[PDB]
């Protein structure tokens, strides 16, 4: 029988008012011969009927991937409302139900620290500009970099690591040409998280 994966909305989507978050319910292994899928969406046991079905994609491995997406309210998802997808199909004995929701647990606001490149690193072409983000919960976060107005794309950010106080932390590393750093350019670390004032904050970091 088919399988069903329930995905949370994208963090920048729940966190920014300008963006529209959505819970995505995905049903794979849908048979070439009973591809009819019925959906029943619920919000805390309460049923809701405003969901949309994305067009059928044939996977070329003999099965269909059937997806139904449901918009969620920024305020409903942060408060912690549980979302439960229910998939039925002639090829599937009892209907299948799955449920997601904002990680449970008191949200903890992140402290953000920007650590300059160590003296020993100034021999290489490019230096490493570090951002420490620690002590947050949930782990769902967004972090990017920019320099006077303009975004700096050359960086890699670690997956959130479970710290020992129950919260999460991470590091973002921005690499810039040593010169840029040597000549007083200012670099800002933008962090976007549920438990921040206005779910946002930037930190400075120049020489």
């Amino acid at each position: 029988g088919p399988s069903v994966f329930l995905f949370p909305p994208k963090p920048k989507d729940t966190l920014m008012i300008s963006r529209t978050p959505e819970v995505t319910c995905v049903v794979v292994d849908v048979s070439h011969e009973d591809p009819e899928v019925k959906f029943n969406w619920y919000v805390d046991g309460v049923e809701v009927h405003n969901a949309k079905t994305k067009p059928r994609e044939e996977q070329y491995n003999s099965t269909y991937r059937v997806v139904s997406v449901l918009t969620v309210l920024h305020q409903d998802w942060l408060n912690g409302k549980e979302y439960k997808c229910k998939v039925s199909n002639k090829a599937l004995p009892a209907p299948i139900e799955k449920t997601i929701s904002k990680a449970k647990g008191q949200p903890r606001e992140p402290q953000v620290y920007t650590l300059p490149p160590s003296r020993d690193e100034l021999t290489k072409n490019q230096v490493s500009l570090t951002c420490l983000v620690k002590g947050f919960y949930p782990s769902d976060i967004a972090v990017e970099w920019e320099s006077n107005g303009q975004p700096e794309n050359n960086y890699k950010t670690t997956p959130p690591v479970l710290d020992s106080d129950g919260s999460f932390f991470l590091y973002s590393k921005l690499t810039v040409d040593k010169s840029r750093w040597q000549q007083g350019n200012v670099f800002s670390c933008s962090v976007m998280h549920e438990a921040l004032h206005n779910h946002y904050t930037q930190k400075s970091l120049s020489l």
């Binding site: 966190l15 920014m16 008012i17 300008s18 963006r19 920019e146 975004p151 933008s190 976007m192 004032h197 206005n198 779910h199 946002y200 904050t201």
Partner: peptide
């Protein structure tokens, strides 16, 4: 007071 990011509004309180 409000917050922004590359333009786009983030949030207010």
């Amino acid at each position: 007071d409000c917050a922004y990011h590359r333009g786009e509004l983030v949030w207010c309180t």
